[PDB]
XYZ file of C-alpha atoms in Angstrom:
79
model
C 99.508 118.959 116.279
C 98.233 122.586 116.092
C 95.372 122.993 118.220
C 91.835 122.338 116.462
C 93.398 119.310 115.503
C 92.572 117.832 119.105
C 88.514 118.280 118.382
C 89.238 117.882 114.721
C 90.633 114.398 114.895
C 87.656 113.769 117.774
C 84.713 114.920 115.346
C 86.140 112.996 112.527
C 87.501 110.107 114.348
C 83.865 109.286 115.733
C 81.955 110.222 112.711
C 83.755 108.427 110.379
C 87.324 107.405 111.092
C 90.665 108.713 111.585
C 91.891 110.546 108.218
C 94.187 112.456 109.470
C 96.748 111.184 107.193
C 94.527 112.089 104.650
C 92.623 115.190 105.894
C 95.182 117.377 107.160
C 96.287 119.139 103.458
C 95.648 123.030 104.882
C 94.033 123.450 101.787
C 89.468 122.957 102.743
C 87.331 120.214 104.608
C 84.687 120.352 101.870
C 86.822 120.937 98.942
C 90.314 118.977 99.208
C 88.714 115.547 99.810
C 84.843 116.358 99.691
C 83.602 114.107 101.450
C 79.744 114.962 102.174
C 77.655 117.572 104.050
C 76.085 115.301 105.913
C 79.180 114.402 107.463
C 81.767 117.531 107.304
C 78.597 119.258 108.887
C 78.316 116.047 111.688
C 82.011 116.335 112.420
C 81.305 119.898 112.804
C 78.626 120.178 114.711
C 79.813 118.092 117.403
C 83.264 120.341 117.664
C 81.267 123.181 118.522
C 78.440 121.154 120.238
C 81.664 120.254 122.837
C 82.953 123.320 122.688
C 80.129 125.583 123.396
C 80.495 128.411 120.768
C 77.805 130.470 118.603
C 79.015 128.761 115.406
C 76.690 127.914 112.515
C 77.523 127.764 108.998
C 80.980 130.101 109.136
C 82.418 126.284 110.176
C 82.047 125.696 106.693
C 84.690 128.216 105.868
C 86.635 128.697 109.183
C 87.819 125.297 109.701
C 88.650 124.392 106.056
C 91.805 125.564 106.798
C 94.198 124.221 109.670
C 94.947 128.238 109.515
C 91.581 129.701 109.909
C 90.834 126.451 112.393
C 93.328 127.174 114.908
C 92.501 131.172 114.678
C 88.833 129.818 115.080
C 89.271 128.208 118.150
C 91.563 130.443 119.477
C 89.550 133.566 118.798
C 86.533 131.940 119.963
C 87.057 129.575 122.755
C 90.610 131.055 123.357
C 91.738 128.359 125.320
């Protein structure tokens, strides 16, 4: 759709399932639905583990918003 959605849908699909129709609200990934730290941190750990970035905890406030997400992968990975 936008950009990060690619890895975002791959991490969430491999972690739990495909909730793109119930996760993409442009609000938050840990607040909007508030799934669970284990899952949230999980799918995220993979996104960066595959992109090879220097993310750590910021991912909990960089991907939460579809806007910040696409800007987080375009500013860091820039690809």
